[PDB]
Amino acid sequence: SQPSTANGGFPSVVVTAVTATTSISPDIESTWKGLLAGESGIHALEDEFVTKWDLAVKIGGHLKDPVDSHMGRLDMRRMSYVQRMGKLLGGQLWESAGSPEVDPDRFAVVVGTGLGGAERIVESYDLMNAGGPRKVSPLAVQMIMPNGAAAVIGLQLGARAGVMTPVSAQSSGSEAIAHAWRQIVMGDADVAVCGGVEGPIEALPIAAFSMMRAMSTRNDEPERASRPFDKDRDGFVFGEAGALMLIETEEHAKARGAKPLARLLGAGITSDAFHMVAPAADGVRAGRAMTRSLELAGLSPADIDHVNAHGTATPIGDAAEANAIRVAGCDQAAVYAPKSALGHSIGAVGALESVLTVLTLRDGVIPPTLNYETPDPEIDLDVVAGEPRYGDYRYAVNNSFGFGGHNVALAFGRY
Amino acid sequence: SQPSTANGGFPSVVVTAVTATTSISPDIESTWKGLLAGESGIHALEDEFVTKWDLAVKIGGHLKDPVDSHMGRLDMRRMSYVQRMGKLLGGQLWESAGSPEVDPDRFAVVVGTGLGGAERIVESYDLMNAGGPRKVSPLAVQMIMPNGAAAVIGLQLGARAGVMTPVSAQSSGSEAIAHAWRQIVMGDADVAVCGGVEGPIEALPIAAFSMMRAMSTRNDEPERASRPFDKDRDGFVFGEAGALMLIETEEHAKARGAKPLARLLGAGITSDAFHMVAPAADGVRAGRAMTRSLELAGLSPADIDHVNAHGTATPIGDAAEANAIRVAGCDQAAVYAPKSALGHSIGAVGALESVLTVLTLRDGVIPPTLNYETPDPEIDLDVVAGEPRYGDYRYAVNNSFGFGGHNVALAFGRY
Numbered sequence: 001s002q003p004s005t006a007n008g009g010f011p012s013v014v015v016t017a018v019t020a021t022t023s024i025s026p027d028i029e030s031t032w033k034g035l036l037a038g039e040s041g042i043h044a045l046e047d048e049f050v051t052k053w054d055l056a057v058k059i060g061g062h063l064k065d066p067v068d069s070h071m072g073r074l075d076m077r078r079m080s081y082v083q084r085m086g087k088l089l090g091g092q093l094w095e096s097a098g099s100p101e102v103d104p105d106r107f108a109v110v111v112g113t114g115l116g117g118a119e120r121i122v123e124s125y126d127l128m129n130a131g132g133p134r135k136v137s138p139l140a141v142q143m144i145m146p147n148g149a150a151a152v153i154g155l156q157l158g159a160r161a162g163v164m165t166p167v168s169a170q171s172s173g174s175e176a177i178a179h180a181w182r183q184i185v186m187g188d189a190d191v192a193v194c195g196g197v198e199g200p201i202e203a204l205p206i207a208a209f210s211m212m213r214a215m216s217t218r219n220d221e222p223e224r225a226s227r228p229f230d231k232d233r234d235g236f237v238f239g240e241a242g243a244l245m246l247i248e249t250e251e252h253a254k255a256r257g258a259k260p261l262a263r264l265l266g267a268g269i270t271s272d273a274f275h276m277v278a279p280a281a282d283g284v285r286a287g288r289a290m291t292r293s294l295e296l297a298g299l300s301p302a303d304i305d306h307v308n309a310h311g312t313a314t315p316i317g318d319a320a321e322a323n324a325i326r327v328a329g330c331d332q333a334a335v336y337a338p339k340s341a342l343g344h345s346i347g348a349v350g351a352l353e354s355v356l357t358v359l360t361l362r363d364g365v366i367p368p369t370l371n372y373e374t375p376d377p378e379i380d381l382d383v384v385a386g387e388p389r390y391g392d393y394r395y396a397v398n399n400s401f402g403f404g405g406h407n408v409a410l411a412f413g414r415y
Numbered sequence: 416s417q418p419s420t421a422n423g424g425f426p427s428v429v430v431t432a433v434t435a436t437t438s439i440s441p442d443i444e445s446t447w448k449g450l451l452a453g454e455s456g457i458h459a460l461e462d463e464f465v466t467k468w469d470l471a472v473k474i475g476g477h478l479k480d481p482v483d484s485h486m487g488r489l490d491m492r493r494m495s496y497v498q499r500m501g502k503l504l505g506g507q508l509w510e511s512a513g514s515p516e517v518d519p520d521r522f523a524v525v526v527g528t529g530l531g532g533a534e535r536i537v538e539s540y541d542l543m544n545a546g547g548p549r550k551v552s553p554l555a556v557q558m559i560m561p562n563g564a565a566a567v568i569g570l571q572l573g574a575r576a577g578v579m580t581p582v583s584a585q586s587s588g589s590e591a592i593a594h595a596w597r598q599i600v601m602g603d604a605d606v607a608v609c610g611g612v613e614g615p616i617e618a619l620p621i622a623a624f625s626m627m628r629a630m631s632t633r634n635d636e637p638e639r640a641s642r643p644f645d646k647d648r649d650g651f652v653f654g655e656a657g658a659l660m661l662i663e664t665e666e667h668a669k670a671r672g673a674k675p676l677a678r679l680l681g682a683g684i685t686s687d688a689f690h691m692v693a694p695a696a697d698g699v700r701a702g703r704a705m706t707r708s709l710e711l712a713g714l715s716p717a718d719i720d721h722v723n724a725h726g727t728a729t730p731i732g733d734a735a736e737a738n739a740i741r742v743a744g745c746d747q748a749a750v751y752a753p754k755s756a757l758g759h760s761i762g763a764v765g766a767l768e769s770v771l772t773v774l775t776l777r778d779g780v781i782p783p784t785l786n787y788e789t790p791d792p793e794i795d796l797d798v799v800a801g802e803p804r805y806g807d808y809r810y811a812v813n814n815s816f817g818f819g820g821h822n823v824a825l826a827f828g829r830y
C-alpha cells in the first residue's frame with residue numbers, strides 16, 4: 001500500500017501562521033469575525049473609471065486597507081502591484097509566526113497569481129510608443145514576470161529551497177499550497193510560505209470578464225449580488241484579496257514552539273480536458289481531485305465534515321461543483337461558499353479560502369453563505385446559511401477550479 | 416535511505432518522443448544535424464521595427480519556420496501566439512509518438528512559459544482606449560492567461576491528470592519537465608507532455624531586456640555574438656524556440672512498444688535568495704539543485720559525463736555557473752552551451768536544452784560550443800568546441816536558471 005499522511009508515508013505537515021488582506025479587513029482575524037457576523041465586503045464601486053467607461057458592472061469589493069498605503073516611494077517605482085502585495089503580506093506573515101530563524105536551505109516559497117505585473121506591460125508599451133526604447137525601465141522585466149511576487153517574497157524572507165509560481169487562473173492560490181505541500185513531503189523543504197496574490201479591480205479586467213457575460217450586474221444591491229448555490233444566482237463578483245500561510249513539518253513546528261492552527265494532509269490536482277472556460281458538467285475530474293486529496297491524506301469521504309466550495313455563483317460553475325462533490329462522496333459535508341461575502345480574487349482566492357478552511361477547523365465553526373435564499377434542486381448540498389454552524393469539524397476539503405479545466409482540492413485536518 | 420531511481424524507490428521514467436522548433440529548423444532532427452555541423456541560428460534582424468526604433472540590438476534568431484505559417488485564420492484571432500505554438504508543437508509531438516491512445520486520467524501536461532499571451536493584453540488595452548469596454552474580445556481572458564498554452568495542449572491531447580504551468584522566467588521550460596517527472600513518480604500520472612513555449616523576438620521585449628545592459632551588441636558579426644564561457648563574451652542573444660517532450664513510466668512505454676530515447680532520472684529545484692536579476696556569485700544553491708537531481712537519480716557526481724550548461728554568455732552568469740558546477744562536483748564533465756548557436760528563448764529554453772541533452776545521450780555525441788576561442792581562467796571547464804565530440808555518454812545534467820534566483824537541474828541517462 002502507498003504512502004499517505006495517516007499511515008506515516010508522508011511526514012505530518014501543519015499550518016502555523018496565516019495572513020490575508022480582504023474587502024472586509026486587512027486583519028485576517030477581523031475578516032473572520034466579520035464573516036461570522038454576516039458581513040459582506042461587496043459595495044458600489046465609486047472609482048472614476050466606472051463612470052468614465054459607463055461599465056455594466058458597478059459593484060465589487062476593494063481591499064478595506066489599500067496595499068499602497070503601506071508602500072514607500074521606491075517600492076512604488078520598483079515593484080508591480082502584485083509584488084507590493086506579496087512584500088506586504090510576506091512581512092506580516094513572518095511577524096505573525098514570531099519571526100523564526102529557519103534554515104534557509106530548507107525553506108521554500110510557492111505563490112501563485114493569475115496574471116502578474118500586467119500594469120507594467122501596458123505602462124512600458126505606452127512609454128516606448130511615446131518616447132522610444134530608452135524610456136522603458138531596466139526593472140520592467142522583473143516587475144512584469146509572473147514569478148515576480150513569489151521571487152520578492154523569497155528574497156524578503158531568505159528562501160533557498162525553491163521559489164515557485166504555478167499559474168492556473170482561478171485555482172492558482174490553492175495550487176501553490178498544494179505544490180508547497182508536495183515540496184515538503186518529497187523532502188526538499190521543511191517549511192514553506194505559500195498562497196496567492198492578485199491585482200485590484202480596474203476597468204480593463206472588468207471589461208474583459210464582462211464580455212464573457214458571467215459577471216453579476218445586480219448594481220442596486222451590491223451585497224446581494226454574489227449568490228453561490230442560490231437558485232437566482234447570476235454570475236460572479238470581484239472581491240480583492242491576497243493570502244499567505246506558513247506550513248512546516250510537525251517536528252519543525254514543535255522544535256521552535258509554534259502552535260499549529262491545523263494540519264495540511266493532502267492535495268489533489270486533476271484537469272477536465274473538456275472546455276477552456278466551462279467546467280465539465282459531470283464534475284468527474286473535479287471530484288477526482290477531491291478523492292486524490294483523501295487518498296494522500298489517508299481519509300475516506302465519510303471523514304469529511306466540511307467543504308469550502310469554490311462556489312463562484314455562475315449557473316454552470318456551481319452546478320458542476322455540486323456534481324463533483326457528489327462524485328467524491330462528500331455531499332453530506334456542511335458547505336460554505338465564501339465568495340458570497342468576499343467575492344472572487346482570481347489567483348489569490350484559493351489561498352484565501354484555504355486560510356478560511358484552516359480557521360473553520362481551528363474554531364469549529366462555518367460562517368453563513370450569504371444570499372442563500374432559494375435552494376436549487378440541481379444543487380442538493382448542505383449549504384450553511386442564515387447563521388454560523390458550530391461543530392467539531394475533524395476534516396475539511398477546500399476546492400478551487402480554473403479556466404483551462406484545472407481542479408485543485410486540499411484536505412485539511414483539525415490539530 | 417530515501418527513494419531514488421537507481422534503488423527502485425521511484426519508478427523508471429523514460430523520454431519517448433521530442434519536438435522543437437528553432438532558429439535553425441522546424442524539425443528537431445535537422446536542428447541537431449545543423450548543431451553538429453557547427454551551424455548558428457543567429458543573424459542580422461531584418462524586421463522593420465529595428466530601424467523604426469533604432470534598436471541597440473540588431474541581431475537574433477527568428478524561427479526558421481514561423482509558427483503562423485501553419486495556423487488557420489480562426490486560431491490567429493482566437494489564440495495567443497504561445498497558444499498557437501503549443502497547439503503546433505503538441506500535435507507534432509503526438510504524431511511523433513505514434514498518436515498513442517493513452518488513459519486520459521493518467522495523462523498530465525506541464526508546460527512553462529515566461530509571460531503568456533501578453534500581446535492580447537496590449538491589444539485589448541488599445542481596443543478599449545479607442546472604442547470602450549465593449550470592444551474587448553470575449554476570448555481575451557482565455558488568450559491572455561499564462562496557463563493558456565498548457566491548457567490548449569491539455570485540451571488538444573485530452574490530458575485529465577493535471578495541466579500545470581510553472582513560471583520561473585528563464586528556467587520555466589526545465590522546471591516544467593521537473594514537475595512532470597515529480598507527478599509521475601508520486602503516482603499522479605503515468606505519461607506527461609512537458610516543456611516550454613515562448614513568444615517571438617519583437618521591439619518591446621528587446622527594449623526591455625536591452626535596458627538591463629546584459630545583451631550582446633556585436634551587430635556586425637551576428638553568428639559570433641553569443642560566446643558562452645569565452646573570455647571575450649559580452650552578453651546574451653535571443654534565439655526563438657519552443658520544445659516539448661513525451662515522458663512516461665518505462666512500464667507504460669514497453670506496454671505500447673515505444674522505444675525510449677533516454678531516461679529522466681531526477682530533478683532538483685532550489686533558489687538563491689540573493690538578487691532578483693543577478694545569480695549568486697558562489698554558485699552554491701545552483702550547485703545544490705544539481706546535487707539534488709543526483710540524490711533523486713541515485714547518482715554521484717563522479718558518474719556525470721556531460722553538463723548542458725545554461726551558459727547565457729553574460730560575464731557574471733557564466734562565472735557563477737562554473738562555480739555551481741564545481742560546487743556540485745561536476746567540473747570534470749564535458750560541457751556544452753547550446754545558446755552559443757540557438758540563443759536564448761526564455762521560457763522555452765530549458766525545455767529545448769533538455770531535448771538536446773536527450774539527443775546527446777541517444778546519439779553519443781556533443782555538438783561544439785560555438786565561438787569558444789579564448790579560455791577564461793575563472794572558468795576552468797572542459798568546454799566542447801571546434802568539432803562535435805563523440806563518446807559513450809551515460810549520464811548528463813541539464814542546468815537552467817531564471818530571474819528571481821530559480822535554479823533547476825535535470826539528470827538524464829542513456830537508455
Ligand SMILES: CCCCCCCCCCCCCCCC(=O)O[C@H](COC(=O)CCCCCCCC[C@H](C)CCCCCCCC)COP(=O)(O)O
Pocket residue numbers: 081114115116117118119120122169170198199200201202203204205208209238239240241344345346403535536539540555556559560561
Ligand atoms: C479582484 C480583482 C481582480 C482583477 C484581476 C485582473 C488582473 C490584474 C492585473 C494587474 C493590475 C494591476 C493594477 C495596479 C496599478 C493600478 O491599479 O493602476 C490603476 C491605473 O490602471 C491601470 O494601470 C490598469 C492597468 C491594466 C493592466 C492590464 C490588465 C489586463 C487585463 C486583461 C485584459 C483581462 C484579465 C485577464 C486575466 C487572466 C488571468 C486569469 C484568468 C490606478 O492608477 P493610479 O491611481 O496608480 O494612477
Ligand SMILES: CCCCCCCCCCCCCCCC(=O)O[C@H](COC(=O)CCCCCCCC[C@H](C)CCCCCCCC)COP(=O)(O)O
Pocket residue numbers: 120121124125140141144145146496529530531532533534535537584585613614615616617619620623624653654655656759760761818
Ligand atoms: C526569443 C524571444 C523571447 C522574447 C519574448 C518576450 C515575452 C513575449 C511576450 C509575448 C509576445 C508575443 C507577440 C506575438 C504577437 C506578434 O508577434 O505580433 C507582432 C506585432 O507586435 C506586437 O504585437 C508585440 C506586442 C508586445 C506585447 C507585450 C510584450 C511585453 C514585454 C515586456 C514589457 C518585456 C518582457 C517581459 C518578460 C517577462 C518574462 C520573462 C522574464 C507581429 O505582428 P503581425 O506581423 O502579426 O502584425
Ligand SMILES: C=C/C(C)=C/[C@@]1(C)SC(=O)C(CCCCN=[N+]=[N-])=C1O
Pocket residue numbers: 170214236238272275276277278279280312314316317344345346401402403404405406
Ligand atoms: C474550465 C472552466 C472553469 C473551471 C470555470 C469556472 C467554474 S472556475 C471560476 O472561477 C469560474 C467563474 C467565472 C470566472 C471567475 N473569474 N474571475 N474572477 C468558472 O466559471
Ligand SMILES: C=C/C(C)=C/[C@@]1(C)SC(=O)C(CCCCN=[N+]=[N-])=C1O
Pocket residue numbers: 585629651653687690691692693694695727729732759760761816817818819820821
Ligand atoms: C537571479 C538571476 C539569474 C539566475 C540570472 C541569469 C543567470 S538566468 C539568465 O537566463 C540570465 C541571462 C540574462 C537574461 C537572459 N534572459 N533572456 N532572454 C541570467 O543573468
Ligand SMILES: [K+]
Pocket residue numbers: 308309310311350353354398399400
Ligand atoms: K474554496
Ligand SMILES: [K+]
Pocket residue numbers: 723724725726765768769813814815
Ligand atoms: K542547459
